[PDB]
CSV table of C-alpha atoms (C1' of nucleotides) in Angstrom, one decimal:
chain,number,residue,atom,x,y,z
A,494,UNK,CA,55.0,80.0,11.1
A,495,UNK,CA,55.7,80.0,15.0
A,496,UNK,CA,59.1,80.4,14.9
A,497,UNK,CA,59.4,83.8,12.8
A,498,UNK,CA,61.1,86.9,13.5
A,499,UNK,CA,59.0,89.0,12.2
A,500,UNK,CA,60.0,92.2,10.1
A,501,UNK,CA,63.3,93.5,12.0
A,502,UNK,CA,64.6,90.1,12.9
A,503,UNK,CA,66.0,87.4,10.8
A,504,UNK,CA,65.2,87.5,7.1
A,505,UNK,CA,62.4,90.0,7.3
A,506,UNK,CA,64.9,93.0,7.3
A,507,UNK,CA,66.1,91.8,4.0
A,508,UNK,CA,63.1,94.3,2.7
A,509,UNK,CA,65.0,97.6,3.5
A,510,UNK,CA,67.7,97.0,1.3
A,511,UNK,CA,65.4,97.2,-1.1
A,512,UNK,CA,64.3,100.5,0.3
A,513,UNK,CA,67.8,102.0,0.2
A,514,UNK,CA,68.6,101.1,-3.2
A,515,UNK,CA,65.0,101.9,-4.3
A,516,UNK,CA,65.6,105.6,-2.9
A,517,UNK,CA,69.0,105.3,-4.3
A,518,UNK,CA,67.6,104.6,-7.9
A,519,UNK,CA,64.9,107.3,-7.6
A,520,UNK,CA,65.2,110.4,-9.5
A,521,UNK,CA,66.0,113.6,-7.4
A,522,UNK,CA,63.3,116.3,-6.7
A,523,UNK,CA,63.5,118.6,-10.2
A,524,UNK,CA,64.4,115.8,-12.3
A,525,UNK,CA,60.7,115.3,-13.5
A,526,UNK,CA,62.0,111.7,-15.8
A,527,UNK,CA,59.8,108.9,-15.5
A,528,UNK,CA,60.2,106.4,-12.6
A,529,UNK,CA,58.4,103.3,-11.4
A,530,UNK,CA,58.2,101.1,-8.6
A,531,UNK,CA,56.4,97.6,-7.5
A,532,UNK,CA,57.1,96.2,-4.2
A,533,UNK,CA,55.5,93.1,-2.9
A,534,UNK,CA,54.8,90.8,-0.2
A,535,UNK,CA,51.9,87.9,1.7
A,536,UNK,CA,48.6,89.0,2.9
A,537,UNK,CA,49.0,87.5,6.1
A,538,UNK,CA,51.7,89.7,8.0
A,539,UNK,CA,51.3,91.1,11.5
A,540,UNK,CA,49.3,93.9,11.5
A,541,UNK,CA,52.2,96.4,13.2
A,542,UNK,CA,54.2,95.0,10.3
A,543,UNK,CA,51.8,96.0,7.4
A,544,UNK,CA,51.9,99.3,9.5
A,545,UNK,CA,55.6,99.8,9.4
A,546,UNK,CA,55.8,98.6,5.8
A,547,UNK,CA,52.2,101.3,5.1
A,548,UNK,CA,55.0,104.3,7.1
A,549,UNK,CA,58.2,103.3,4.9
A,550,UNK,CA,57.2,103.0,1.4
A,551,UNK,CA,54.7,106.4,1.8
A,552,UNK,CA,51.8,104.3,0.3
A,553,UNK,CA,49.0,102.0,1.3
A,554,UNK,CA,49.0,98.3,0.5
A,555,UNK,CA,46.7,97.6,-2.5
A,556,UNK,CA,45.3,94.1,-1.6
A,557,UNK,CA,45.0,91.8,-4.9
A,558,UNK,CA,43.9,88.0,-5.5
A,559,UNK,CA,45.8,85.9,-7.7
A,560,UNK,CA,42.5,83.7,-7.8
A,561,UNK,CA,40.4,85.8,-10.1
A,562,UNK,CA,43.0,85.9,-12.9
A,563,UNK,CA,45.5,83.2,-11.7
A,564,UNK,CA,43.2,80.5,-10.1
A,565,UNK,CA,45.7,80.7,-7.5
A,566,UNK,CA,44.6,81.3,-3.8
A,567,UNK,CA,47.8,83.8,-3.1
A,568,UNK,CA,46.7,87.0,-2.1
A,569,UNK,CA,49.5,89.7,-2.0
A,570,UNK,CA,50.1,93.0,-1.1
A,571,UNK,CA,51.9,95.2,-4.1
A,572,UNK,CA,53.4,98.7,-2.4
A,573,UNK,CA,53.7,101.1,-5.7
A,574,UNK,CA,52.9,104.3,-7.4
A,575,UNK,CA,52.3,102.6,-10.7
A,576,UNK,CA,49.4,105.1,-12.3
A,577,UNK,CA,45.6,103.3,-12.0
A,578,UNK,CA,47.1,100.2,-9.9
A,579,UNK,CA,43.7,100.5,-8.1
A,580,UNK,CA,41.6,99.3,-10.9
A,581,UNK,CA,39.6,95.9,-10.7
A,582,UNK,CA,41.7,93.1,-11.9
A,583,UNK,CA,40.9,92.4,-15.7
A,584,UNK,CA,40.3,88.6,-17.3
A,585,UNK,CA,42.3,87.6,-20.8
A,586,UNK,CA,41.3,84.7,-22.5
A,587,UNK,CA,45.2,83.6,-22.4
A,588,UNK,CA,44.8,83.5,-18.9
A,589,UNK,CA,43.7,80.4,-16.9
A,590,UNK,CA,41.0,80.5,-14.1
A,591,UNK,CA,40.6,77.0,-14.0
B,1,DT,C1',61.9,78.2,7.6
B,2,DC,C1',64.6,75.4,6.6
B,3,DG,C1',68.6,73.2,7.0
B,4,DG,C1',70.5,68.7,8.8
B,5,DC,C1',69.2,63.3,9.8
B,6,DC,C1',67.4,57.4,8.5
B,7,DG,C1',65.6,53.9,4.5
B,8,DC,C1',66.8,52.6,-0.3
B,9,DC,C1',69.1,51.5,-4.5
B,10,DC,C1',73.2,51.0,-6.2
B,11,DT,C1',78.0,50.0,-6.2
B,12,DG,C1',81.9,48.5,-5.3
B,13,DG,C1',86.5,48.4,-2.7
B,14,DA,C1',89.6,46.4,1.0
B,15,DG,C1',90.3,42.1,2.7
B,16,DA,C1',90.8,37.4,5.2
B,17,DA,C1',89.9,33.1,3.5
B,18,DT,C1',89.8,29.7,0.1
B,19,DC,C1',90.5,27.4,-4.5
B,20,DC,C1',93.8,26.5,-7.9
B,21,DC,C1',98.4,25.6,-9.3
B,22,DG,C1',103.1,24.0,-9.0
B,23,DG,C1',107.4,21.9,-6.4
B,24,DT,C1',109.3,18.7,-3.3
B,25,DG,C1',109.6,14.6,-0.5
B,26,DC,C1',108.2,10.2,1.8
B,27,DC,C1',106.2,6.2,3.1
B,28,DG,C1',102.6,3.2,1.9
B,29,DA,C1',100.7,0.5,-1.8
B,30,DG,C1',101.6,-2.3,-6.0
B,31,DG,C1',104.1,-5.9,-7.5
B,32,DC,C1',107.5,-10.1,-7.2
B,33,DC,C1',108.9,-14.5,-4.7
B,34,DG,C1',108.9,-18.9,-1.6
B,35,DC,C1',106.1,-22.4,0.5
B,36,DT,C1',102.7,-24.7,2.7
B,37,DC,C1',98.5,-25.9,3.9
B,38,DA,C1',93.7,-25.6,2.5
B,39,DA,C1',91.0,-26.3,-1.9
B,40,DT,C1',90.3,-29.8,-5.0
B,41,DT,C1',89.2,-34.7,-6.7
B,42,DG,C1',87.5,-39.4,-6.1
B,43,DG,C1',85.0,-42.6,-3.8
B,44,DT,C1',81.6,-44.2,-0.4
B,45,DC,C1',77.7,-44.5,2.7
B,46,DG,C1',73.7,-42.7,5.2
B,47,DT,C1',70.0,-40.2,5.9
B,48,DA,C1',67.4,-35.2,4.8
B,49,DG,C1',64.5,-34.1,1.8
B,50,DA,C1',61.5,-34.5,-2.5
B,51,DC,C1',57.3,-36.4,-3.6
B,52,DA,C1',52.8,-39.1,-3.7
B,53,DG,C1',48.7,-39.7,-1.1
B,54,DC,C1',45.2,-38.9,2.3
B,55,DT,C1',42.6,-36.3,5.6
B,56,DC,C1',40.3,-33.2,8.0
B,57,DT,C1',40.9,-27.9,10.0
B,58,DA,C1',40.1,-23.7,9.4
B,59,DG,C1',39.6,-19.9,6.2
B,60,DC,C1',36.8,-17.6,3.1
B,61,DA,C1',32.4,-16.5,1.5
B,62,DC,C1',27.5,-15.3,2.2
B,63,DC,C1',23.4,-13.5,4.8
B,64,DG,C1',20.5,-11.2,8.2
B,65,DC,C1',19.8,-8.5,12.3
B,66,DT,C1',21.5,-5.1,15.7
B,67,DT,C1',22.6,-1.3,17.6
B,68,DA,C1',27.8,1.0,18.2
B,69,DA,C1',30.0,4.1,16.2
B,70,DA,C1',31.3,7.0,12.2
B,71,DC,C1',29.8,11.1,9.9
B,72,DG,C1',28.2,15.8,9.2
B,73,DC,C1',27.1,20.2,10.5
B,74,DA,C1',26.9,24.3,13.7
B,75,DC,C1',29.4,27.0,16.8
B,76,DG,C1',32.2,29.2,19.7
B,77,DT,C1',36.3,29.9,22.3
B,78,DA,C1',41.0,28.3,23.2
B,79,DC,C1',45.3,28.0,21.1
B,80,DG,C1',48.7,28.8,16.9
B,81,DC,C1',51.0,32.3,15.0
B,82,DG,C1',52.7,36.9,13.8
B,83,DC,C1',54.5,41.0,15.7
DNA sequence: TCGGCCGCCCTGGAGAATCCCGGTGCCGAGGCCGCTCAATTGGTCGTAGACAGCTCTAGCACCGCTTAAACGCACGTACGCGC
């Protein structure tokens, strides 16, 4: 899109919100209770802004197709310390590839 | 990204003009009257036209050549028409 503001500017800061009250929601150091986060967003960011997003949220992206189990072409990045979110993407016959 | 601009259908609402509907008034048309002259009737002549007869002119019909022109097909570019 030529005319976007990238990640500081316009709508793209709407994302640190998110961030606060994600921290804001997370239990305090001690307090060993479960707690889970998924954050998402499009493949095709600037490459500083994948950066900044990589030095906020603590994590690296995981990169994952729709198309193999969604026979969508939307590839996403998922921030998250979900446990085994690196694992290949699985296929259920409920799902539709075609 | 993403919010602000032109057809399309649908619809009808103000709105200036027009049709319909009454109310009044007037002057032009329908009807009555005298009268007088043009339509009618009767008769008579005179010739325009109806009709018989003849004739003889041209109009229609036919036929055979003879090319002059009408027809038909290709074709291509100039003009009719839509935008």
């Amino acid at each position: 899109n030529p005319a976007r503001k990238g990640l500081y500017e316009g709508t793209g800061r709407l994302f640190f919100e998110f961030y606060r009250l994600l921290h804001d929601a997370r239990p305090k150091e001690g307090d060993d209770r479960p707690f889970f986060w998924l954050f998402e967003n499009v493949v095709a960011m600037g490459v500083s802004d994948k950066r900044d997003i990589s030095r906020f949220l603590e994590s690296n992206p995981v990169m994952i197709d729709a198309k193999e189990v969604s026979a969508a072409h939307r590839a996403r990045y998922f921030w998250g310390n979900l446990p085994g979110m690196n694992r290949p993407l699985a296929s259920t016959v409920n799902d539709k590839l075609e």
